[PDB]
């Protein structure tokens, strides 16, 4: 039941008690994911308009 690293200041204090010892995607890659999904949306909408044109 030890107390270690006791620090005291005007507005409080802090300490540590030990009860027992122990035993990314680049900017370019993000643009491709975003643009890839935008392209699939464009493809789907084109197939809708083609359907409506038929």
């Amino acid at each position: 039941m030890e107390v270690i690293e006791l620090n005291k200041c005007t507005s409080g204090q802090s300490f540590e008690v030990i009860l027992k010892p122990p035993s990314d995607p680049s900017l370019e890659e993000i643009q491709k994911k975003l643009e890839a999904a935008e392209e699939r949306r464009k493809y789907q909408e084109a197939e809708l308009l083609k359907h409506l044109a038929e």
Partner: protein, 425 residues
């Protein structure tokens, strides 16, 4: 500023649409001349959803009246709130559609559709941010059915990423005008399966049975039936027209109600439905039990014949929200065999402090149930009883249609019924 553009087409579409604007105009304090005379800020919080604001503080409905004959719209322009509509938003012809889907969709209707879209484009161009469209119409006639679905097809082509909702009156032989209604409804349903996000199915037989059995109306008229539709339409649009702890536009509502794109046909209901024992205060348990009772449903389908994919219940008026959750959680936890177990928490509840006119409190029911397949089954059976003999087909082939298009509408309908069947087991 999430505006909705309203469109009403054909006799049924315009008579039901007329009453709808009559009902909600009253709820927002708008008199027949478009002047606001309410007493609560809640009446204007979301007024622009359905109304434009003209000079002089005048509110004009964002509504477009369509028909292939003048009669019904002349009646609207002379009705109670007829003067409130933008004169330029009446688009009509003179030939009529003869209860013929081909006339509304391919011949007479095609001659008029461009000028209808001119008005729609005008209303949309004036919207800060368009939510989507709503169409009121019947499926048994020719204008609302044939030209209504033509309008939807062209609105989707020009506004592909806007929400398209309809209130669609399904025909029934008990309340029928012509024998070709199954032909017209079957041709329309396929259009709706493809080009609407949410369709509130309203069955004239259910509207009839409610007026006779529950409401005790000896010989119901079309006006009586439309009173139920008005009240229901006001109910389903409550959480769009008034401010509340629910921030939901048409798209967010569709996302949570439609798990599969083609299964977007809803059963609406309303409570109370009291015969004239009418001043009796209705308790929360009674509201809840009635709102889930088939006799209060307008699709003429027994929910116990299928399973609910999603359910939305809207409670209006001052009541115990704590007591609402208890009764709601009582209906589900007492009949969980009719809710699918693969959509967690598929029963949602919304509240609104403003009750309808002349009611301390009410409840509107919105169910996406697989039992709706029974409605499409009836239609399909009536369609095939005539089509196997090619009866009355000449009215359609005389307008350029071929028998192949009927066979395809038949298959599409039966595929729809088959799709509901698998999600019920």
């Amino acid at each position: 500023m999430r505006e909705i553009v309203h469109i009403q087409a054909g006799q049924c579409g315009n008579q039901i649409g007329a009453k709808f604007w009559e009902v909600i105009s009253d709820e927002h304090g708008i008199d027949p001349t478009g002047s606001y005379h309410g007493d609560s800020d809640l009446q204007l919080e979301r007024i622009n959803v359905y109304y434009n604001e003209a000079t002089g503080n005048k509110y004009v409905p964002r509504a477009i009246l369509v028909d292939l004959e003048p009669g019904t719209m002349d009646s609207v322009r002379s009705g109670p709130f007829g003067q409130i509509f933008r004169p330029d938003n009446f688009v009509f012809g003179q030939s009529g559609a003869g209860n013929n889907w081909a006339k509304g969709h391919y011949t007479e209707g095609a001659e008029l559709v461009d000028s209808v879209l001119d008005v729609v484009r005008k209303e949309s161009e004036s919207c800060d941010c368009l939510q989507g469209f709503q169409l009121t119409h019947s499926l048994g006639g020719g204008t609302g059915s044939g030209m209504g679905t033509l309008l939807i097809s062209k609105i989707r082509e020009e506004y592909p990423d806007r929400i398209m909702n309809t209130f669609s009156v399904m025909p029934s032989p008990k309340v029928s005008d012509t024998v070709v209604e199954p032909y017209n409804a079957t041709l329309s349903v396929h259009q709706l399966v493809e080009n609407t996000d949410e369709t509130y199915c309203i069955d004239n037989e259910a509207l009839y049975d409610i007026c006779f059995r529950t409401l005790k109306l000896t010989t119901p008229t079309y006006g009586d039936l439309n009173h139920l539709v008005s009240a229901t339409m006001s109910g389903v649009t409550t959480c769009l027209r008034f401010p509340g702890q629910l921030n939901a536009d048409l798209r967010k509502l569709a996302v949570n109600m439609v798990p599969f794109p083609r299964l977007h046909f809803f059963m609406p209901g309303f409570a109370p439905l009291t015969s004239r024992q009418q001043y009796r205060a209705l308790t929360v348990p009674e509201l809840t039990q009635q709102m889930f009772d088939s006799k209060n449903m307008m699709a003429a389908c027994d929910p116990r014949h299928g399973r609910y994919l999603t359910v939305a219940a809207i409670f209006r008026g001052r009541m115990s929200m704590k007591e609402v959750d208890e009764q709601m959680l009582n209906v589900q936890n007492k009949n969980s065999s009719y809710f699918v177990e693969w959509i967690p928490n598929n029963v949602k509840t919304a509240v609104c402090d403003i009750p309808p006119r002349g009611l301390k409190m009410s409840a509107t029911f919105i169910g996406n149930s697989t039992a709706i397949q029974e409605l499409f089954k009836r239609i399909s059976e009536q369609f095939t009883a005539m089509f196997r003999r090619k009866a009355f087909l000449h009215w359609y082939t005389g307008e350029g249609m071929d028998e192949m298009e009927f066979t395809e509408a038949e298959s599409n309908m039966n595929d729809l019924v088959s799709e509901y069947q698998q999600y019920q087991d």
